[PDB]
């Protein structure tokens, strides 16, 4: 059972690109000496909810800066990119850090993004599935030969080749029903989104399982993770007020007045927000509903560093 961090790096009127970026760095430095085994970075473009578009870079920087934690890209949208860049970057990361990089990717969520990157949608999934083929080819072979309706070029070697046989550890982010299917077929772990309802993770979770079955894969081993937001305050109202102030834009952005109030209260209740007893309990249920072997929390919302930092030690001393 593994634990770790993750940075969304949300910027506001109260915290700016420079602030967040540092704080993040500041924290990775701290955690390094603890028992957190992984750091992940959230990829986000053109809005205040995630001040990073290239998770692989930050990954490199943190990789270069740490001694103990694996470091991983949380949701690299390979759907809107050039699989080669991706692959080169990834093996590269694996090579330079010598086996300390993990590769979490994902399909494209915001519709727009896809549009902005010349990406048509009629192929969105296949396009995705493809990129991965290739990325995956390279990983395993050190080469590639596309020749698809999506991309065509002559065969090539993709340097540096890859430290880790087969390539770095991979994972997919659970955004759609159709993705968990595919992912299950190849029997590869997932990462459950903290913004998803407990039920949602369940379905998916189960879904995965059911499919893992029906095809052959022996996922007894597969380890999935889950991300959750942590925020504890001995004043539950406070921890709740802070967090909502914190997710306010995220929500108006992603869950378009679907019931801002409804959605919000739900995240407010499903995430690990509250007082210790409230926080800790909620974690627990979340884990159980989707069965994750790994928990990636995020202590970002906590404005006061001391408390935030004091929340971390606590979660640390647990183990």
């Amino acid at each position: 059972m593994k634990f770790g961090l993750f940075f969304l790096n949300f910027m506001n009127s109260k915290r700016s690109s420079d602030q967040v970026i540092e704080e993040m760095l500041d924290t990775a430095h701290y955690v390094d000496q603890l028992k957190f085994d992984t750091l992940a970075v959230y990829e986000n473009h053109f809005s205040n909810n995630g001040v990073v578009g290239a998770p692989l870079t930050v990954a490199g920087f943190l990789l270069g800066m740490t001694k103990n934690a694996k470091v991983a890209s949380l949701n690299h949208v390979i759907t809107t990119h050039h699989p080669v860049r991706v692959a080169e970057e990834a093996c590269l990361l694996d090579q330079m850090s010598e086996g300390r990089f993990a590769f979490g990717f994902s399909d494209c969520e915001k519709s727009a993004d896809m549009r902005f990157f010349n990406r048509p949608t009629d192929s969105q999934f296949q396009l995705f599935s493809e990129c991965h083929k290739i990325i995956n080819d390279a990983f395993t072979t050190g080469y590639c030969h596309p020749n698809n309706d999506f991309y065509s070029f002559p065969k090539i070697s993709v340097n540096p080749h890859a430290f880790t046989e087969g390539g770095p550890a991979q994972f997919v982010n659970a955004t759609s029903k159709e993705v968990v299917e595919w992912a299950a077929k190849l029997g590869l772990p997932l990462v459950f989104r903290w913004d998803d309802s407990n039920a949602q993770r369940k379905e998916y979770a189960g879904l995965y399982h059911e499919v893992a079955q029906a095809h052959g894969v022996d996922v007894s081993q597969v380890r999935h993770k889950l991300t959750l937001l942590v925020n504890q305050n001995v004043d539950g109202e406070a921890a709740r007020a802070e967090a909502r102030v914190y997710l306010e834009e995220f929500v108006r952005e992603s869950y378009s007045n679907t019931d801002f109030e409804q959605k919000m209260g739900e995240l407010l209740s499903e995430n690990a927000i509250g007082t210790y007893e409230e926080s800790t309990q909620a974690a627990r249920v979340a884990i159980e509903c989707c069965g994750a072997a790994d928990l990636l929390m995020s202590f970002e919302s906590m404005e006061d560093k001391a408390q935030q930092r004091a929340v971390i030690d606590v979660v640390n001393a647990n183990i």
């Binding site: 420079d18 990073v52 578009g53 290239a54 920087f61 050039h82 590269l92 070029f153 090539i156 340097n159």
Partner: protein
């Protein structure tokens, strides 16, 4: 002055890819220990000439691994990537490193890079010129957009925000003069071939100058660069020997890099050479220290430029590559002197 260590990540026939990645990181680190104030990286796809095709990422690793060292990308091939994505990367880089990143750009020499990255082959200069603007604009405004035959994307916000005012310092790796001109028009500092000579160099300058001036820049602060390949040893004969072999390899490798030439693939759309190079070791810091020292001052005294960056991979081994940088640090480094 300013010293730099130049790294290609050229793979010798006796070193496996891994081996090279390791030596690559060790050198990046050792750099400063050797008196070098910047480490510069070349970008190159799919071949032994250069294994490192993503300088931003590499840069982030070393930048992260160090407190004060500086890192630059000797040659980011401008066109082949998306400006937005590059802007975010440089910006992250700049902000995370706290201003320790040098953005050396370049136009693009191998076809391959283009046939695979799916970029416009002929427009090579346009692109670079244009990409540059958008990026530029994002650099201080905080926004980016398009509207040309090149790309089209609507106004978006750009994160994070530049650390170093107006963006990271930009350099141009320029050989051509259409390009020497381009630079000058914006008065960008630059990097000079190690294949050309004193006159040749000095002459590129003038050209840079008559423009720089026509546009009112102060040629006095523009920091250009003397880029060379180095070989410091006591036996002048070994130094030059070793070096001769390197350039066979380099050259050969260099040549092969004009590979994907069997016509069953179209770059149609949907979505060569110079002359003698084997003797260019005669114009670079190769041989005893005394020999190095002279060769350098000469270009110095002739251009005014106080930044010379060198590449030691020629010595091949990790050890030799070091000795020859330590040698230099003690024996060449002290003895150089500013312009006229």
């Amino acid at each position: 002055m300013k010293f730099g260590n130049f790294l290609l990540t050229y793979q010798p026939p006796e070193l496996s890819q891994t081996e090279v990645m390791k030596r690559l990181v060790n050198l990046g680190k050792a750099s400063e220990g050797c008196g070098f104030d910047t480490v510069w990286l070349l970008e190159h796809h799919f071949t032994e000439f250069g294994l490192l095709g993503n300088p931003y990422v590499a840069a982030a690793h070393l930048l992260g691994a160090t407190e004060t060292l500086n890192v630059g990308t000797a040659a980011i091939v401008l066109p082949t990537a998306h400006p937005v994505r590059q802007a975010e990367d440089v910006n992250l880089l700049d902000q995370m490193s706290k201003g320790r990143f040098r953005f050396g750009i370049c136009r693009g020499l191998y076809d391959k890079d283009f046939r695979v990255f799916g970029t416009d082959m002929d427009n090579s200069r346009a692109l670079m010129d244009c990409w540059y603007d958008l990026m530029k604009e994002g650099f201080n405004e905080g926004y980016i957009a398009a509207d040309n035959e090149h790309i089209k994307f609507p106004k978006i916000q750009l994160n994070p925000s530049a650390y170093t005012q107006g963006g990271a310092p930009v350099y141009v790796v320029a050989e051509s003069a259409s390009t020497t001109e381009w630079a000058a028009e914006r008065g960008l500092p630059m990097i000079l071939s190690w294949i050309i000579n004193t006159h040749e160099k000095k002459a590129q300058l003038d050209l840079y100058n008559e423009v720089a001036t026509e546009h009112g820049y102060d040629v006095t602060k523009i920091d250009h660069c003397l880029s060379y390949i180095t070989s410091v040893d006591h036996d002048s004969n070994r130094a030059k020997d070793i070096c001769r072999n390197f350039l066979g390899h380099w050259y050969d490798s260099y040549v092969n890099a004009t590979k994907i030439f069997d016509d069953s693939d179209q770059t149609k759309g949907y979505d060569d050479t110079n002359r003698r190079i084997d003797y260019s070791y005669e114009i670079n810091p190769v041989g005893t220290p005394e020999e190095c020292i002279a060769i350098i001052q000469q270009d110095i005294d002739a251009t005014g430029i106080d930044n010379i960056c060198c590449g030691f991979e020629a010595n091949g081994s990790e050890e030799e590559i070091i000795a020859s940088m330590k040698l230099f640090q003690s024996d060449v480094m002290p003895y150089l002197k500013e312009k006229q």
